[PDB]
């Protein structure tokens, strides 16, 4: 194990969430992954380093860096902890404009369609496909297993293209039933 450092810069809007949530962020990194943790107030970035005398898993540094990135992107902490617990979880990201060029309220309505009432549509995707979704304005992030995120993306893309939420929800119960079977 060699001395290696990772720097993950966080945007300003995630500062306050970290400060209140950081009490639960540094423990798992320092105890389970055995990393040396700082966040630089001057650069507003999170710094992780392998301790040569203590670190044993060489992948703990990158595993921690991805975990910080997930919280940086907007995922809830417990969801971000899944990255540390697991090794086969990835973040898929894309923009609505990639699917289709929507502007003005058309763009706004598409975002509403993805979220659904009270966020109802989004959680249906999350429970059906075994993933978590962060809908940051026109930017979408999906966290989960490679197959699962692929199953999550197709549904939100369908909603972007203009498929009604009800029909999409009908597809979700079908795939959810298949998921339980396998």
């Amino acid at each position: 194990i060699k001395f290696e450092s990772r720097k993950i810069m966080v945007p300003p809007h995630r500062m306050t969430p970290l400060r209140n949530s950081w009490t639960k962020i540094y423990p798992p990194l320092v105890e389970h992954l055995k990393l040396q943790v700082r966040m630089n107030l001057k650069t507003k970035s999170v710094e992780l380093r392998t301790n040569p005398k203590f670190t044993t898993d060489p992948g703990a540094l990158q595993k921690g860096a991805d975990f910080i990135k997930a919280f940086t992107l907007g995922f809830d902490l417990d969801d971000s902890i899944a990255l540390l617990r697991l090794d086969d979880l990835y973040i898929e990201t894309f923009e609505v404009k990639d699917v289709k060029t929507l502007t003005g309220d058309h763009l706004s309505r598409a975002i509403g369609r993805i979220a659904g009432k009270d966020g109802k549509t989004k959680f249906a995707i999350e429970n059906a496909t075994r993933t978590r979704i962060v809908l940051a304005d026109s930017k979408i992030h999906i966290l989960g297993g490679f197959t699962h995120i692929r199953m999550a993306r197709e549904s939100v893309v369908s909603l972007i293209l203009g498929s009604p939420p009800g029909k999409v929800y009908g597809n979700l119960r079908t795939v959810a039933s298949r998921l339980k079977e396998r």
């Binding site: 417990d78 899944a82 429970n127 989960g144 039933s177």
Partner: peptide, 21 residues
């Protein structure tokens, strides 16, 4: 089958944990 549409009390790490166990 009806799919839960509200926030799952059980987190992803817990969801994958159940799959193992």
């Amino acid at each position: 089958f009806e799919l839960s549409d509200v926030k799952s009390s059980k987190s992803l790490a817990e969801i994958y944990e159940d799959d193992y166990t």
